[PDB]
Specification:
The structure is cut from a larger assembly and holds 1 copy of chain A (about 110 residues), 2 copies of chain B, 1 copy of chain C (about 130 residues), 1 copy of chain D (about 700 residues) and 1 copy of chain E (about 110 residues).
Chain C (H helix, E strand, L loop, with lengths): L1 H4 L1 E7 L6 E9 L12 E5 L10 E5 L6 E6 L7 E8 L5 E5 L2 E7 L8 H16 L4
Parallel strand pairs in C: 1-7, 2-8
Antiparallel strand pairs in C: 3-4, 4-5, 5-8, 6-7
Chain D lengths: L6 H15 L4 H12 L3 H5 L10 E2 L2 E7 L3 E3 L5 E3 L2 H6 L5 E13 L6 E14 L14 H4 L13 E3 L2 E4 L3 E4 L5 E3 L6 E9 L9 E8 L6 H4 L5 E4 L7 E2 H6 L6 H7 L7 H7 L12 H9 L10 H13 L14 H15 L16 E4 L2 H27 L14 H13 L17 E2 L5 H5 L5 E2 L36 E2 L6 E2 L6 H9 L18 E4 L2 E2 L6 H14 L8 E5 L4 E5 L5 E2 L1 E4 L26 H4 L4 E3 L10 E2 L2 H4 L12 E2 L22 H8 L8
Parallel strand pairs in D: 20-23, 27-28
Antiparallel strand pairs in D: 1-5, 2-5, 3-4, 5-6, 7-8, 8-16, 9-15, 10-11, 11-12, 12-13, 13-14, 17-18, 19-24, 20-21, 22-23, 25-26, 25-28
Chain E lengths: L5 E2 L1 H4 L3 E8 H7 L7 E10 L2 E8 L7 E2 L2 E2 L4 E9 L4 E12 L9 H4 L1
Parallel strand pairs in E: 1-8, 2-8
Antiparallel strand pairs in E: 3-4, 4-5, 6-8, 7-8
Classes of the chains: A mainly beta (about 110), B alpha+beta (about 180), C mainly beta (about 130), D alpha+beta (about 700), E mainly beta (about 110).
The structure holds zinc ion (ZN) (2 copies).
Amino acid sequence: VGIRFCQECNNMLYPKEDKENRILLYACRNCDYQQEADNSCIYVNKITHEVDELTQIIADVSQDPTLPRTEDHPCQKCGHKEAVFFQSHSARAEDAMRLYYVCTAPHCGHRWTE
Amino acid sequence: FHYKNVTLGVPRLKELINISKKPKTPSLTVFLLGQSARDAERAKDILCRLEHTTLRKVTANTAIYYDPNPQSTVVAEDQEWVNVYYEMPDFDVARISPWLLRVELDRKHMTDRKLTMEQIAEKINAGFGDDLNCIFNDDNAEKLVLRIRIMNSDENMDDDVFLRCIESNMLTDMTL
Amino acid sequence: GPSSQNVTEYVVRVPKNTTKKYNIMAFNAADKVNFATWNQARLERDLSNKPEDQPWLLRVNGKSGRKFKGIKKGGVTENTSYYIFTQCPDGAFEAFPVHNWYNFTPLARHRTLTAEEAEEEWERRNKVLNHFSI
Amino acid sequence: EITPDLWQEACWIVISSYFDEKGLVRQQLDSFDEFIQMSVQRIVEDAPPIDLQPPRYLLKFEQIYLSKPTHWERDGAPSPMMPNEARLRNLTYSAPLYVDITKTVIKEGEEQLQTQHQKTFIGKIPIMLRSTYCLLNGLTDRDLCELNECPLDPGGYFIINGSEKVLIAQEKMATNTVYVFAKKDSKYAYTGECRSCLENSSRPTSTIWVSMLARGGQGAKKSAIGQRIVATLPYIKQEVPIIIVFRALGFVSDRDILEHIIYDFEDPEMMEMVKPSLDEAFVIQEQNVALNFIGSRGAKPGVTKEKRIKYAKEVLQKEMLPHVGVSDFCETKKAYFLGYMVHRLLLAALGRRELDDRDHYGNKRLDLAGPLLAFLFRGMFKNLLKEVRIYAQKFIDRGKDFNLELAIKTRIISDGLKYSLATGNWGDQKKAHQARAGVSQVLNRLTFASTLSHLRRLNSPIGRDGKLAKPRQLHNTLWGMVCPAETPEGHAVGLVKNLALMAYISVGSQPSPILEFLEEWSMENLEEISPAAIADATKIFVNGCWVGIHKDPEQLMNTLRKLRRQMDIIVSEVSMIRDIREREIRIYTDAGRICRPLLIVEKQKLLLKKRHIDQLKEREYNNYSWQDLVASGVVEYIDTLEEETVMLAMTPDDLQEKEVAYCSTYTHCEIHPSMILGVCASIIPFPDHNQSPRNTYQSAMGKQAMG
Amino acid sequence: AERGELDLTGAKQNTGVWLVKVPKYLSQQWAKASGRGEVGKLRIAKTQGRTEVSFTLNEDLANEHPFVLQSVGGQTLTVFTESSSDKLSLEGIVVQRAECRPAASENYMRLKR
Amino acid sequence: ESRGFVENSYLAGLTPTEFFFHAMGGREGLIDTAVKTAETGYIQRRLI
Ligand SMILES: [Zn+2]
Ligand SMILES: [Zn+2]
């Protein structure tokens, strides 16, 4: 799923097929450096696009003076009783009125939806 | 705009004044003849039967794997159904293509149009040729996957870029 | 250790003259070049530009050896001069001015794709994909 | 020490301090004093000498002087003209202009003979009234009445052939920044732009696009690979792939190119998108053949090879991104910026950042009298040097000698400025067809509030009949900087606009003091730092140019704030934006940004204690005024861009009380929310009780009331 | 013996050199180097958890500059020469980089406050 | 109240944030009339 760079000329390693041992070989076009593939899959295309933005929001958003705050929902990892919540603010806005939270305690940065 | 979408007023007038080919929202109103005009279910079935539906609307994700042998089954759990096909092995005519294409489907978007991968399976074959070959699961299994390989008669221009071209071509030119 | 408790004081001089101009020769750490493998080197100004401005051409090991190209930095004394500080047998320090900064990079002596030929190849390949469709 | 509910009389005592010092037309008077103290000295000083030839000669200009406006009588006796006689006798209010020229002859005749002629006459410049160069500067009311002048007259206009002309501020798209749009009609699926100009020194402004072709291209040649990133450089005919123009700067390898464009190699989704960009630039794989490829299609197709490799060298060196650096050295910077321009185009295709807004008022700049007369003075100083040659060559081929007092055609600058100001078309006399019209109209003197509402007026240069509504509708960003109610009806609805009461336009400065701070806080150099270790760093821009990186932003932010509060090193006009999400920091110092003062708020209390009020109601015999209020860190000018990273409270006694509260991290507070109205719309009693279109009619109707 | 021939002795000796950044006004003071070229004396104090280097101007040159040590990691640095006889020589590899700064550069304290 | 609902009457007067939204609505209602005249005049001339 990732990418492979050549170890000699630092370029993009293409996948190739050899008719001897039935194993995927990654080859270079400039040089002909070789090696075998460990996962033996090339292409993947996610159309659902249901990526949870809990992996994209940053912990320093709790320094924003223009975001609402809450005393109801406390943090689990530290027990702080003050959070700051917001919406998806991104694409995939068909049914996007969820409410992600971020703890505001210094050096906690814990994030969670509900 | 204060009133879905309809054009009225003076712009609709000069759309009538001239007969310019481009109405800003062409729309044909349709009426229904049989009890289908009465019950909502037949209305909805003819609704789905009239609307255009492509492939990328009924797929979840696709992946190009590499099975040099159909018994290799790089992904862990698809071995069961591909094997119960494999004890009934047909079409090993020229070779077996080491390049595989795996497609995952969303039963939500599948059933809403009253589709299941049987009709898809024949028409993705009947309509494109026979250069492709589709084996599939049973829908009792929760996730609906069907795997495709090129017809090995071609192996006796790279097949990887060709398979990516075909993958990027079928999801938009499906015509379900 | 002496890096922790070490103490000392040494005199610094800045001679108004030198017998040779001093330049910096910089290498990417990521390459981790073994200088011991350099049995010999040749060093000449680059010929693409057909002097003091010329980029350097470094050829390691005389005949059979490595090769790098050195490209001059934009500035070296535009705001602050750079000095080479060297330890002398008397313990006193000697400072040497940096005349220039040259950037040295590794070279790929493999593969030669050709212009007009490459473009012609691309069109045929582009044409081939369009042909035999549906 | 706090101010509880004495607020209604306290807010009107700081606003009085503002207008007692600044005034209402400081907009006009400050951009002029700039154009004539700095922007005119730099133009003649930064001009190429005219070495010409056997012997050869030298000429270079050193220093500029001016004298007070003067009128030459019928028999040649000068006398200072007062602004009143200029109105009565249909004169023109202008001042003569001198210069020092030095001339050295170089014939290697065993002697270098140099000589200079100082204070040489050049021409005459109009003078804006009440400036620092007028005859009315710093006079008292007993003397203003003695010259038959009104002590209430604001100033800020020219007198040209008896008439009274006023210059209208023109709007303009901001420069030196990257904007991402999407033309949904043409071949492109996305587009970037960057208008560059190297610090007020270029007549044109080179613009460069970085496109991306559409997905639904009918054709299997591209159905599988995908869209290819393209670029449309200036001074060339054909489109160019980006990898080609990357190699023309060196960087032929594809591990070095793909680290200027992608800053972290754990991202497969982006690398897949840049892969089909290499496939078409694969066969052309070295520098010199690349320069030939771009060099083959220019304003002149090269017949030979060396000229194309020469032609492609400077166009890629003096017309590509001149704001980064124009020297032939330092070409690693033109690579990073061109990489950031492309890295930002991909983020707009994966849907990770939103597209830019055209009418967002943080992307606009304003051209006052300063940046308008300076643009018109370049094209007439070059035109004056272009015709000293034509007179020198004709006169030195005969080998006699040279004399310069007869070479200078003085009618070039005098009649050049006076023409375009009097008639309006912003061009030349033989260029009455290629110029921008509508500038420099006649002052309106129907009633005293129709005069003030004329010296404060903007104008967006879009057409006057286009039916597109988005350049006409009211944007929310106009809060507090443009009057929302005052606009004319007819065909010019929303095209001309008046600015609010406390809105202040910046004048410009140099960023060198901030650069000293950057070394003081050890901002990391872009070249010095590892390219790989850049993702975990906040790219630091200054005035549009990427100038390094830095890994400690939060400490830097508090530090920048304290520096602003003292204001010792940085002027209030500068704006410093930090966006946490995109992980960068911007700084601006140029002229044209629009500001307005606000009240600084600490933890939850104002910084304006009572000690500041009981000593501010005494300005008459205490010498404590608005300036001593900014320099104490209780108010602060806030730009439009910076106004997106702020949290405002409308009123202290009501929004900064601890409770179950809306917010708790207020950063600023307004003075009085009634300063969001223009000049003609702030004479309406109870304007918050009428229907909205009614307030628009009166503001366009109190301009024609007799008084 | 050839013009394009580079001496590798320094490198092969693993010869080390020090690199120090110096302000121009100080460097202008240094162009007026006392005597043959002496400019002053360098003082080095190292402790168990702190190391201090500074330079003090020659009394003649006067008529404390602390050093800031800078990393040389990420890029290998060596010094190479061109004689007045145009012979080429590699003197050494850079083992230290540094930047002397004037002490107490005005307010900084005010900025911190 | 945060997206345009003016809950006062013209008599009791409007608060600043409501006075701004009212101005916006009035402005669009004022532009449409400026367009309409030219459009209808031209189309009628053609047809006649
Ligand atoms: Zn390789
Ligand atoms: Zn927490």
